[PDB]
Coordinates of C-alpha atoms and ligand atoms in Angstrom, one line a residue:
Chain A
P443 CA 0.1 -0.2 0.1
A444 CA 0.8 3.2 -0.4
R445 CA 2.2 5.8 2.4
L446 CA -0.8 7.5 3.3
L447 CA 0.2 11.3 4.2
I448 CA -3.0 13.4 5.2
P449 CA -2.5 16.5 7.7
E450 CA -3.2 16.1 11.0
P451 CA -5.1 19.0 13.0
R452 CA -3.5 21.8 14.0
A453 CA -2.4 21.1 17.5
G454 CA -1.3 24.5 18.8
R455 CA 1.8 24.5 20.0
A456 CA 2.6 28.0 18.6
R457 CA 1.3 29.5 21.7
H458 CA 3.6 27.7 23.8
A459 CA 6.5 29.0 21.5
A460 CA 5.3 32.7 22.1
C461 CA 4.8 32.1 25.9
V462 CA 8.6 30.7 26.4
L463 CA 10.0 33.6 24.1
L464 CA 8.2 35.7 26.3
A465 CA 9.5 34.2 29.3
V466 CA 13.0 34.5 28.1
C467 CA 12.7 37.8 27.1
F468 CA 11.3 38.7 30.3
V469 CA 14.4 37.0 31.9
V470 CA 16.7 39.1 29.4
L471 CA 15.1 42.1 30.7
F472 CA 16.0 40.8 34.2
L473 CA 19.5 40.7 34.2
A474 CA 8.9 48.2 37.9
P475 CA 9.6 51.8 36.2
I476 CA 8.9 50.6 33.0
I477 CA 5.3 49.2 33.2
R478 CA 3.7 52.4 33.2
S479 CA 5.8 52.2 29.6
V480 CA 3.8 49.2 28.5
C481 CA 0.5 51.0 29.0
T482 CA 2.1 53.1 26.5
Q483 CA 2.2 51.4 23.9
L484 CA -0.7 48.7 25.0
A485 CA -3.6 51.2 24.6
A486 CA -1.9 52.5 21.4
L487 CA -2.7 49.0 20.0
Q488 CA -6.2 48.5 21.7
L489 CA -7.4 52.2 20.0
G490 CA -6.6 50.9 16.6
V491 CA -8.8 47.7 16.9
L492 CA -11.5 50.3 18.2
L493 CA -10.7 51.8 14.9
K494 CA -11.5 49.1 12.8
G495 CA -14.8 48.5 14.5
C496 CA -15.7 52.3 13.7
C497 CA -14.8 51.5 10.1
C498 CA -16.9 48.5 10.3
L499 CA -20.0 50.7 11.0
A500 CA -19.6 51.9 7.7
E501 CA -20.5 48.9 5.5
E502 CA -22.7 47.3 8.1
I503 CA -25.0 50.6 8.0
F504 CA -25.5 49.7 4.4
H505 CA -26.6 46.0 5.6
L506 CA -29.4 47.2 8.6
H507 CA -32.1 45.3 7.4
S508 CA -31.0 42.9 4.8
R509 CA -28.6 40.8 7.0
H510 CA -28.8 42.2 10.6
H511 CA -32.6 43.6 11.2
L512 CA -29.4 49.0 15.7
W513 CA -27.5 47.0 18.7
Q514 CA -28.0 43.6 17.1
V515 CA -25.2 45.3 14.2
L516 CA -23.2 46.9 16.9
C517 CA -23.0 43.3 18.6
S518 CA -22.2 42.2 15.6
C519 CA -19.2 45.2 15.1
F520 CA -16.4 45.2 17.1
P521 CA -14.4 41.8 18.8
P522 CA -16.6 41.4 22.1
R523 CA -14.4 42.3 24.5
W524 CA -14.6 46.0 24.0
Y525 CA -14.7 47.2 27.3
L526 CA -10.4 46.4 28.0
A527 CA -9.6 48.7 25.0
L528 CA -11.8 51.7 26.4
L529 CA -10.4 50.7 30.1
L530 CA -6.6 50.8 28.8
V531 CA -7.3 54.1 26.7
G532 CA -8.4 56.0 30.3
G533 CA -5.2 55.3 32.0
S534 CA -2.8 57.5 30.6
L535 CA -1.9 61.0 20.7
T536 CA -3.2 62.2 17.6
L537 CA 0.4 60.3 16.2
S538 CA -1.1 57.2 17.2
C539 CA -4.5 57.5 15.4
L540 CA -3.1 58.8 12.5
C541 CA -0.5 55.3 12.1
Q542 CA -3.4 52.9 12.9
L543 CA -5.4 54.7 10.1
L544 CA -2.4 55.0 7.7
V545 CA -2.3 51.0 8.6
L546 CA -6.0 50.5 7.9
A547 CA -6.3 52.3 4.9
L548 CA -3.1 50.6 2.5
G549 CA -4.3 47.2 4.2
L550 CA -1.2 45.7 5.6
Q551 CA -3.3 43.4 7.5
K552 CA -3.5 40.7 4.9
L553 CA -3.2 37.3 6.2
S554 CA -0.7 35.0 5.4
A555 CA -1.2 31.1 4.1
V556 CA -1.0 29.2 6.9
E557 CA -3.4 31.7 9.0
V558 CA -6.2 31.3 6.6
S559 CA -5.6 27.6 6.4
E560 CA -6.3 27.3 10.5
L561 CA -9.2 29.2 10.3
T562 CA -10.6 27.7 7.0
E563 CA -10.0 24.1 8.9
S564 CA -10.4 24.7 12.0
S565 CA -14.0 25.6 11.8
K566 CA -16.8 23.3 10.4
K567 CA -17.7 25.8 7.2
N568 CA -15.2 24.9 4.3
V569 CA -16.1 23.0 1.3
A570 CA -15.1 19.4 2.1
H571 CA -16.7 19.4 5.9
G572 CA -19.9 20.2 3.8
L573 CA -19.6 18.4 1.4
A574 CA -18.9 15.4 3.5
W575 CA -21.7 16.0 5.6
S576 CA -24.2 16.1 2.0
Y577 CA -22.6 12.7 1.5
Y578 CA -22.7 10.8 5.0
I579 CA -26.7 12.3 5.4
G580 CA -28.0 11.5 1.9
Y581 CA -26.3 8.6 0.6
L582 CA -24.9 6.8 3.3
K583 CA -27.1 7.3 6.2
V584 CA -29.4 6.0 4.1
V585 CA -28.3 2.9 2.0
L586 CA -26.0 1.6 4.1
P587 CA -28.7 -0.2 6.4
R588 CA -30.7 -1.6 3.7
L589 CA -27.3 -3.4 2.4
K590 CA -27.3 -6.7 3.8
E591 CA -30.9 -7.6 3.0
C592 CA -30.4 -6.9 -0.9
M593 CA -27.0 -9.0 -0.4
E594 CA -29.4 -11.8 0.9
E595 CA -31.6 -11.2 -2.0
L596 CA -28.7 -11.6 -4.9
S597 CA -27.8 -14.4 -2.1
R598 CA -30.4 -16.9 -3.3
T599 CA -29.9 -16.4 -7.1
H600 CA -18.2 -15.1 2.6
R601 CA -20.3 -12.9 5.1
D602 CA -17.4 -11.2 5.8
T603 CA -17.0 -9.4 3.1
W604 CA -20.3 -8.0 2.4
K605 CA -19.5 -4.4 2.5
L606 CA -19.3 -1.3 1.0
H607 CA -15.8 -0.3 -0.1
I608 CA -15.8 3.5 -1.3
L609 CA -12.9 4.1 -3.4
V610 CA -11.4 7.8 -2.3
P611 CA -8.9 8.9 -5.2
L612 CA -7.0 11.4 -3.5
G613 CA -6.0 13.3 -6.5
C614 CA -7.6 13.4 -11.0
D615 CA -8.8 10.3 -12.1
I616 CA -11.9 9.7 -11.8
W617 CA -13.5 7.1 -14.1
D618 CA -16.9 6.0 -14.9
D619 CA -16.2 2.4 -16.5
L620 CA -14.6 0.7 -13.9
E621 CA -13.8 -2.0 -16.3
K622 CA -11.9 0.5 -18.2
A623 CA -9.4 1.0 -14.9
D624 CA -8.3 -2.6 -15.1
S625 CA -8.6 -5.9 -17.2
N626 CA -9.3 -8.0 -13.5
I627 CA -12.5 -6.0 -12.6
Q628 CA -15.4 -7.3 -14.0
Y629 CA -19.2 -6.4 -14.0
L630 CA -21.7 -9.3 -12.6
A631 CA -24.6 -7.7 -11.9
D632 CA -26.6 -5.1 -9.6
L633 CA -28.1 -5.2 -6.2
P634 CA -32.0 -4.9 -6.0
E635 CA -32.8 -1.2 -5.9
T636 CA -34.4 1.3 -3.2
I637 CA -37.2 3.1 -3.8
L638 CA -37.8 6.4 -1.4
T639 CA -40.0 9.3 -1.9
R640 CA -37.4 11.8 -1.0
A641 CA -37.7 15.7 -1.3
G642 CA -40.7 16.2 -3.5
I643 CA -39.6 13.6 -5.9
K644 CA -41.6 10.1 -6.0
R645 CA -39.9 6.9 -6.0
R646 CA -36.1 8.1 -6.0
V647 CA -34.5 4.9 -7.2
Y648 CA -30.8 4.2 -5.4
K649 CA -28.9 1.4 -7.3
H650 CA -25.6 -0.3 -6.8
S651 CA -23.2 -3.2 -8.4
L652 CA -21.2 -6.0 -7.7
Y653 CA -18.1 -6.7 -9.0
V654 CA -16.0 -9.9 -9.3
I655 CA -12.1 -9.6 -9.4
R656 CA -9.9 -12.4 -9.6
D657 CA -6.9 -14.5 -10.3
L658 CA -11.3 -15.3 -7.0
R659 CA -13.7 -12.9 -5.0
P660 CA -16.8 -10.8 -5.1
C661 CA -17.4 -7.4 -3.7
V662 CA -19.3 -4.1 -3.9
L663 CA -17.9 -1.2 -5.0
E664 CA -18.3 2.3 -6.0
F665 CA -16.2 5.5 -6.2
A666 CA -17.0 8.0 -4.0
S667 CA -19.1 10.6 -6.5
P668 CA -18.7 14.4 -4.9
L669 CA -14.7 14.4 -5.4
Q670 CA -15.7 14.6 -9.3
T671 CA -17.2 17.9 -8.3
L672 CA -14.4 19.3 -7.1
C673 CA -12.8 17.9 -10.6
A674 CA -14.8 20.5 -11.8
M675 CA -14.8 23.0 -10.0
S676 CA -10.9 24.4 -10.8
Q677 CA -10.9 22.8 -14.6
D678 CA -13.6 24.9 -15.3
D679 CA -11.8 27.4 -13.6
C680 CA -15.1 29.5 -12.5
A681 CA -14.5 28.9 -9.2
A682 CA -11.3 30.0 -7.3
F683 CA -9.9 26.9 -6.8
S684 CA -6.6 25.0 -7.3
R685 CA -4.7 21.9 -8.0
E686 CA -2.6 21.8 -4.7
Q687 CA -5.5 22.7 -2.6
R688 CA -7.7 20.2 -4.9
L689 CA -5.6 17.9 -3.7
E690 CA -5.8 19.3 0.1
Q691 CA -9.6 19.7 -0.2
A692 CA -9.6 16.2 -1.2
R693 CA -7.2 15.2 1.9
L694 CA -9.2 17.3 3.6
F695 CA -12.5 15.2 2.5
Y696 CA -11.2 12.0 3.2
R697 CA -10.0 12.9 6.9
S698 CA -13.4 14.7 7.4
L699 CA -15.3 11.4 6.2
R700 CA -13.2 9.3 8.1
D701 CA -14.2 11.2 11.3
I702 CA -17.9 11.3 10.3
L703 CA -17.8 7.6 10.3
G704 CA -15.7 7.4 13.1
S705 CA -18.1 8.2 15.5
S706 CA -21.1 6.9 13.5
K707 CA -23.6 4.6 15.2
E708 CA -25.6 3.5 12.3
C709 CA -22.6 2.6 10.0
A710 CA -21.6 -0.7 12.1
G711 CA -18.8 -2.1 9.6
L712 CA -20.4 -1.9 6.3
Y713 CA -18.2 0.6 5.2
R714 CA -14.7 0.3 4.4
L715 CA -13.1 3.3 3.2
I716 CA -10.2 3.0 0.5
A717 CA -8.0 5.8 -0.3
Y718 CA -5.0 6.5 -2.6
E719 CA -2.9 8.4 -4.4
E720 CA -1.3 7.5 -8.0
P721 CA 2.2 5.9 -7.3
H722 CA -2.1 -3.5 -12.8
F723 CA -2.6 -1.8 -9.7
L724 CA -6.2 -0.7 -8.3
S725 CA -7.3 -4.2 -7.8
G726 CA -4.0 -5.0 -6.3
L727 CA -4.8 -2.4 -3.7
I728 CA -8.7 -3.6 -3.5
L729 CA -7.3 -7.3 -3.3
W730 CA -5.0 -6.2 -0.6
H731 CA -8.0 -4.5 1.7
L732 CA -10.1 -7.5 0.5
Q733 CA -7.7 -10.3 1.6
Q734 CA -6.9 -8.1 4.6
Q735 CA -10.0 -8.2 6.8
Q736 CA -9.6 -12.1 6.2
Chain B
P861 CA -45.2 37.7 -3.1
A862 CA -43.1 38.1 -0.1
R863 CA -40.8 40.8 0.2
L864 CA -36.9 38.8 -0.8
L865 CA -34.2 40.2 1.0
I866 CA -31.1 38.5 0.4
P867 CA -27.6 40.3 1.1
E868 CA -25.9 42.3 -1.3
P869 CA -22.2 41.1 -1.9
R870 CA -19.7 43.3 -0.3
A871 CA -19.0 46.6 -2.2
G872 CA -15.9 47.5 0.0
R873 CA -16.6 51.5 1.0
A874 CA -15.2 51.2 4.6
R875 CA -12.1 51.8 2.8
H876 CA -13.2 54.8 1.7
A877 CA -14.2 55.5 5.1
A878 CA -11.2 55.4 6.4
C879 CA -9.3 57.3 3.8
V880 CA -12.0 60.0 4.5
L881 CA -11.2 60.1 8.1
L882 CA -7.3 59.6 7.4
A883 CA -7.6 62.9 5.4
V884 CA -9.6 64.8 7.8
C885 CA -7.5 63.9 10.9
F886 CA -4.4 65.2 8.4
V887 CA -6.9 68.3 8.0
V888 CA -6.9 68.7 11.7
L889 CA -2.9 68.1 12.2
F890 CA -2.3 70.9 9.4
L891 CA -4.8 73.7 11.5
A892 CA 8.0 67.4 8.6
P893 CA 9.2 67.3 12.4
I894 CA 6.9 64.7 13.3
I895 CA 7.8 62.1 10.3
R896 CA 10.2 60.6 11.7
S897 CA 7.9 60.0 14.6
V898 CA 5.7 58.5 12.4
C899 CA 8.5 55.6 12.0
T900 CA 8.9 55.4 15.3
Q901 CA 5.6 54.1 15.7
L902 CA 5.3 52.2 12.5
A903 CA 8.0 49.6 12.1
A904 CA 7.1 48.6 15.9
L905 CA 4.0 47.6 14.0
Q906 CA 6.1 45.6 11.3
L907 CA 8.0 44.0 13.9
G908 CA 5.4 42.2 15.6
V909 CA 3.8 41.0 12.5
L910 CA 7.3 39.2 11.7
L911 CA 6.9 37.7 14.8
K912 CA 3.5 36.0 13.9
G913 CA 5.5 34.9 11.2
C914 CA 8.3 33.2 13.9
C915 CA 5.6 31.8 16.0
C916 CA 4.2 30.5 12.7
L917 CA 7.4 28.8 11.9
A918 CA 6.8 27.0 15.2
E919 CA 3.6 24.5 14.4
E920 CA 4.4 24.0 10.6
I921 CA 7.9 22.8 11.4
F922 CA 5.6 19.8 12.4
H923 CA 4.1 19.6 9.4
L924 CA 7.0 19.7 6.9
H925 CA 5.8 16.8 4.7
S926 CA 2.3 16.1 5.6
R927 CA 1.2 19.0 4.3
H928 CA 4.1 21.2 2.5
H929 CA 6.6 18.8 1.3
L930 CA 11.9 24.1 3.7
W931 CA 11.5 26.7 1.3
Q932 CA 7.8 26.4 0.8
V933 CA 6.9 26.4 4.4
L934 CA 8.8 30.1 5.0
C935 CA 7.2 30.9 1.9
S936 CA 3.8 30.6 3.0
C937 CA 4.5 31.2 6.7
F938 CA 4.8 35.3 6.9
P939 CA 2.5 37.7 4.4
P940 CA 4.3 38.0 1.5
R941 CA 5.6 41.7 1.2
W942 CA 8.2 40.8 4.2
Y943 CA 10.8 43.2 2.6
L944 CA 9.0 46.6 3.9
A945 CA 8.8 45.3 7.7
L946 CA 12.9 45.1 7.5
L947 CA 13.2 47.8 5.7
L948 CA 11.1 49.8 8.1
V949 CA 12.8 48.2 11.5
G950 CA 16.8 49.1 9.6
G951 CA 15.7 53.0 9.9
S952 CA 15.8 53.9 13.8
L953 CA 13.0 48.3 21.4
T954 CA 12.7 45.2 23.9
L955 CA 9.7 47.2 25.3
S956 CA 8.2 46.9 21.5
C957 CA 9.1 43.0 21.1
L958 CA 7.6 42.5 24.8
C959 CA 4.5 44.2 24.0
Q960 CA 4.0 42.2 20.9
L961 CA 4.7 39.1 22.5
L962 CA 2.4 39.9 25.3
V963 CA -0.4 40.3 22.6
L964 CA 0.6 36.9 20.5
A965 CA 0.2 35.3 23.8
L966 CA -3.2 36.5 25.4
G967 CA -4.9 36.1 21.9
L968 CA -6.6 39.5 21.9
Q969 CA -6.4 39.4 17.9
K970 CA -9.3 37.8 17.5
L971 CA -11.5 38.9 14.6
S972 CA -15.3 39.9 15.2
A973 CA -18.5 38.5 13.4
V974 CA -18.5 40.9 10.4
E975 CA -14.4 40.1 9.5
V976 CA -15.2 36.7 9.7
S977 CA -18.2 36.9 7.5
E978 CA -16.7 38.9 4.7
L979 CA -13.7 36.6 4.8
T980 CA -16.3 33.7 4.2
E981 CA -18.4 35.1 1.6
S982 CA -15.8 36.9 0.1
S983 CA -13.7 33.5 -0.9
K984 CA -15.3 31.0 -2.9
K985 CA -14.5 28.1 0.0
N986 CA -17.6 28.1 2.3
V987 CA -20.2 25.7 2.7
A988 CA -23.3 27.4 0.5
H989 CA -21.0 28.0 -2.9
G990 CA -19.3 24.3 -3.1
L991 CA -23.0 22.7 -2.4
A992 CA -24.3 25.0 -4.9
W993 CA -21.7 23.8 -7.0
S994 CA -22.2 20.3 -6.3
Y995 CA -26.2 20.9 -7.3
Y996 CA -25.3 22.4 -10.4
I997 CA -22.8 20.1 -11.5
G998 CA -24.1 16.9 -10.3
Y999 CA -28.1 17.4 -11.2
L1000 CA -29.0 20.5 -13.3
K1001 CA -26.0 20.1 -15.9
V1002 CA -27.1 16.6 -16.5
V1003 CA -30.8 16.5 -16.3
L1004 CA -32.1 19.7 -18.0
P1005 CA -31.0 19.2 -21.4
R1006 CA -32.5 16.1 -21.5
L1007 CA -35.8 17.7 -20.6
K1008 CA -38.0 18.8 -23.6
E1009 CA -37.6 15.2 -25.1
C1010 CA -39.4 13.4 -22.1
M1011 CA -41.9 16.4 -21.8
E1012 CA -42.6 15.5 -25.5
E1013 CA -42.8 12.1 -25.1
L1014 CA -45.3 12.5 -22.3
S1015 CA -47.1 14.8 -24.9
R1016 CA -48.0 12.2 -27.2
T1017 CA -49.5 10.5 -23.9
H1018 CA -48.6 25.2 -22.9
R1019 CA -44.8 25.3 -24.7
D1020 CA -44.3 28.0 -22.6
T1021 CA -43.9 26.5 -19.6
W1022 CA -42.5 23.2 -20.0
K1023 CA -39.7 24.2 -17.2
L1024 CA -38.6 22.9 -14.1
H1025 CA -39.4 25.0 -11.1
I1026 CA -37.3 24.4 -8.2
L1027 CA -39.2 25.3 -4.9
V1028 CA -35.9 26.7 -2.6
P1029 CA -37.6 27.4 0.5
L1030 CA -35.4 30.0 2.9
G1031 CA -36.1 28.6 6.1
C1032 CA -36.7 25.1 7.9
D1033 CA -39.8 23.4 6.4
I1034 CA -38.8 20.4 3.7
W1035 CA -41.4 18.2 3.0
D1036 CA -41.1 14.7 1.1
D1037 CA -45.0 14.5 0.3
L1038 CA -46.1 18.1 -1.7
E1039 CA -49.3 16.4 -1.4
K1040 CA -49.4 16.9 2.3
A1041 CA -48.3 20.6 1.4
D1042 CA -51.2 21.8 0.4
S1043 CA -54.7 20.2 -0.6
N1044 CA -54.6 21.7 -4.6
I1045 CA -51.3 20.3 -5.6
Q1046 CA -52.2 17.1 -7.0
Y1047 CA -49.3 14.1 -8.4
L1048 CA -50.5 12.7 -11.5
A1049 CA -47.4 11.0 -13.5
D1050 CA -43.7 11.0 -13.7
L1051 CA -41.3 11.6 -16.6
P1052 CA -39.7 9.2 -18.7
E1053 CA -36.4 8.5 -16.9
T1054 CA -32.9 9.4 -17.3
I1055 CA -30.1 6.3 -17.4
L1056 CA -26.1 7.3 -16.5
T1057 CA -23.2 5.1 -16.0
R1058 CA -22.0 7.8 -13.0
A1059 CA -19.0 7.4 -11.1
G1060 CA -18.7 4.0 -11.1
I1061 CA -22.4 3.1 -10.2
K1062 CA -23.8 1.4 -13.3
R1063 CA -27.2 2.7 -14.4
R1064 CA -27.8 5.1 -12.3
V1065 CA -31.4 6.6 -12.5
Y1066 CA -32.5 10.1 -12.4
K1067 CA -36.6 10.9 -12.2
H1068 CA -39.1 13.5 -12.0
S1069 CA -42.8 14.3 -11.5
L1070 CA -45.5 15.7 -12.6
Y1071 CA -47.8 17.7 -10.6
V1072 CA -51.3 19.4 -12.3
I1073 CA -52.2 22.5 -10.1
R1074 CA -56.1 23.7 -11.1
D1075 CA -59.0 26.0 -9.1
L1076 CA -56.2 24.6 -14.5
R1077 CA -52.4 23.7 -15.3
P1078 CA -49.9 21.4 -15.2
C1079 CA -46.1 22.0 -14.4
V1080 CA -42.4 20.2 -13.0
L1081 CA -41.7 20.8 -9.5
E1082 CA -38.9 19.9 -7.0
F1083 CA -37.2 20.9 -4.1
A1084 CA -33.9 22.1 -4.0
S1085 CA -32.7 19.0 -2.1
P1086 CA -29.5 19.8 -0.4
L1087 CA -31.5 22.2 1.8
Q1088 CA -32.1 19.3 3.6
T1089 CA -28.9 18.6 4.4
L1090 CA -28.3 21.9 5.9
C1091 CA -31.5 21.3 8.1
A1092 CA -29.4 18.3 9.3
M1093 CA -26.2 20.1 9.8
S1094 CA -27.5 21.8 12.9
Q1095 CA -30.4 19.8 14.4
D1096 CA -28.0 16.9 15.2
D1097 CA -25.3 19.4 16.6
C1098 CA -22.5 17.2 15.2
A1099 CA -21.6 20.4 13.6
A1100 CA -21.3 24.2 14.5
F1101 CA -24.2 25.3 13.1
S1102 CA -27.1 27.8 14.1
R1103 CA -30.4 28.4 12.9
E1104 CA -29.8 32.1 12.1
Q1105 CA -26.6 31.2 10.5
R1106 CA -28.6 28.1 8.9
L1107 CA -31.0 31.2 7.1
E1108 CA -28.0 33.2 6.3
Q1109 CA -26.3 29.8 4.8
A1110 CA -29.5 29.5 3.1
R1111 CA -29.8 32.5 1.4
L1112 CA -26.1 32.6 0.7
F1113 CA -26.9 29.3 -0.9
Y1114 CA -30.1 30.8 -3.2
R1115 CA -27.7 34.0 -4.2
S1116 CA -24.9 31.6 -5.6
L1117 CA -27.3 29.6 -7.9
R1118 CA -28.9 32.3 -9.0
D1119 CA -25.2 33.6 -10.1
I1120 CA -24.1 30.4 -11.5
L1121 CA -27.6 30.1 -13.4
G1122 CA -27.4 33.8 -14.2
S1123 CA -23.8 32.9 -16.5
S1124 CA -25.2 29.8 -17.4
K1125 CA -25.2 28.3 -21.0
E1126 CA -26.9 25.4 -21.4
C1127 CA -29.6 25.8 -19.0
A1128 CA -31.2 28.0 -20.9
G1129 CA -34.8 29.1 -20.0
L1130 CA -35.4 25.5 -18.4
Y1131 CA -35.0 26.5 -14.7
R1132 CA -37.1 29.1 -12.9
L1133 CA -36.1 29.8 -9.2
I1134 CA -38.4 30.3 -7.0
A1135 CA -37.8 31.0 -3.5
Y1136 CA -39.5 32.1 -0.3
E1137 CA -40.1 32.6 3.3
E1138 CA -42.5 31.4 5.8
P1139 CA -44.6 34.6 6.1
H1140 CA -53.3 27.9 1.0
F1141 CA -50.4 30.0 0.2
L1142 CA -47.8 27.3 -1.5
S1143 CA -50.2 26.8 -4.4
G1144 CA -50.8 30.5 -4.4
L1145 CA -47.2 31.4 -4.9
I1146 CA -46.6 28.7 -7.7
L1147 CA -49.8 29.7 -9.6
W1148 CA -48.3 33.5 -9.5
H1149 CA -44.8 32.8 -10.9
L1150 CA -46.7 30.1 -13.3
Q1151 CA -49.4 33.0 -15.3
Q1152 CA -46.1 35.5 -14.6
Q1153 CA -44.4 34.2 -17.6
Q1154 CA -47.5 34.1 -19.3
Ligands
1SY1854 N1 -34.6 15.2 -6.6 C1 -33.4 14.3 -7.0 N2 -33.1 13.1 -7.7 C2 -32.1 12.4 -8.2 O1 -32.6 11.8 -8.7 C3 -30.6 13.3 -7.6 N3 -29.7 12.5 -7.9 C4 -28.3 13.5 -7.1 N4 -29.2 14.4 -7.1 C5 -28.7 15.8 -6.0 O2 -27.8 16.1 -7.1 C6 -27.1 16.1 -7.0 C7 -25.8 15.3 -7.4 O3 -25.5 14.4 -6.7 P1 -23.6 14.5 -6.1 O4 -23.1 13.2 -7.1 O5 -22.9 15.9 -6.3 O6 -23.8 13.9 -4.3 C8 -25.0 13.0 -4.2 C9 -24.1 11.6 -4.5 O7 -22.8 11.9 -4.0 C10 -25.1 10.5 -3.3 N5 -25.8 10.3 -4.3 C11 -27.3 10.6 -4.0 N6 -28.1 9.6 -4.9 C12 -27.1 8.9 -5.6 C13 -27.5 7.8 -6.5 N7 -28.4 7.3 -6.7 N8 -26.3 6.9 -7.0 C14 -25.2 7.6 -6.5 N9 -24.8 8.4 -5.5 C15 -26.0 9.2 -5.1 O8 -25.7 11.3 -2.6 C16 -25.1 12.9 -2.9 C17 -26.2 14.0 -2.4 O9 -27.4 13.9 -2.9 P2 -28.5 14.6 -2.9 O10 -27.8 15.8 -1.5 O11 -29.5 14.1 -1.6 O12 -28.5 15.8 -4.1 C18 -28.3 15.2 -5.3 C19 -26.6 15.9 -5.1 O13 -27.5 16.9 -4.3 C20 -30.7 14.3 -6.9 N10 -31.9 15.1 -6.8

């Protein structure tokens, strides 16, 4: 199997390194008269933060009813601990205000790549987590409990392997015809369908397929579909989206899906996530996962 | 029809208000000796930004190969115009460094609601835009060109109305049985299906339905499905997601879908977005949209 390097979540040791550098710099400040001097700089920052809120009253007043329907807007305007800044302003000029305005005009407070990356993958509001929730709720929550009955119905036409391997290709190749993927992968038949009236559509139909892979074992197998969506979210270039970020979002999607099916409760063992990169081959990986459980 | 208040995109007039306040404050500074003093504050900011990059070398060194595979990491570490800060540091102490570290330790640089809102909806990497791209590529790109042929095939069993009204309920109510939605909405039949081998599944089936609404007109009609996903992304509470943000994300989804089908090229006039809030009724709105085109 190929080496799976998916990124871990952020541990948050940067604050620890900042604290250590703070303590070391205080020790070198060792080897009372200057503490007031600290305040002469400190509220100098906390003015400008307030200034940012003042400018954020600018556009938000054009969004009163359409986004916020007064006190809600000013509640949303500045960071929530606003009284510390005024508390520090009271404990004491135009140069500071003009410097903060000269910063805020030219826009030199642009965050870097790693900061927006941690802000993206920290919140659960990016593309990959929402799309993984869509794939979990819309498909996997519904089909997977009805898998064993259709398997038994085809059985009247190996109980360890009655699962649903989801191929998750961390990359670009997504194929509709898996018989073009290898000469070893062969189509045999399909499962009995599933009929559900979902979201106004009456009798929506979910299907499957059964693939026999030999040298001599059957399995159910399909691709994780919405990666295909990402495959058109950068090729068509109508979304601001790059290939390196495409690989990043695919790894994030596999990580989020692994997390969701980790704490899943209905999906007992019926799923089996197979993920890979491009280093024939795919049948060899399928056979390795298939023999691994036995 | 109900009043549709969807939020406009950010115009960006806050920078203009900052510039005006800058010019006015410079005029009051009117009515050369102090400009060097500006630099004594100015690089005082640009040190600390560099300090943030120093702390962002901390956790990123635990993410060398798993996210970035040296120079790529330091390239991603600080904001890209790094030389202006060192240029300003050269033009001239421990108090400034300790103040910036004391800020970065306690974490008082937390962005407000409106800043993270503009950062979210500014980039095309939130939940609603990616999910709208999924609904456009997976379903609307495929089905809609094959609509007229199925309509003509049922016609051999009103050409102005041969469309697909997508009900987009900006809210919480999403129903599977539209006959429970009103006594006026009646199910009649379904369109001939669509069979496509998509993403490894052989013979995936797309269906539709035809609803006759009288007092005396037929139409095709369905719900925008993945809003249902959002309806379970906060009720089950396994995602950090609120109801006010649910209404916000639904409005954002309708806006993004309106934008995508605005610049669409295959979907000629075959879609017709109907969106509403909860103020019987739904049939009255459907009849108003249906009579509006004629
Ligand atoms: N009304 C309606 N009838 C349909 O047959 C249908 N099929 C798809 N869709 C909607 O279009 C989009 C395309 O599916 P996508 O591939 O991007 O992810 C889909 C897809 O990965 C998976 N899935 C759903 N139905 C099938 C299916 N029959 N076969 C394989 N996978 C499916 O579940 C994901 C989410 O489905 P929904 O989020 O409930 O609505 C889908 C989706 O929004 C349909 N909408």
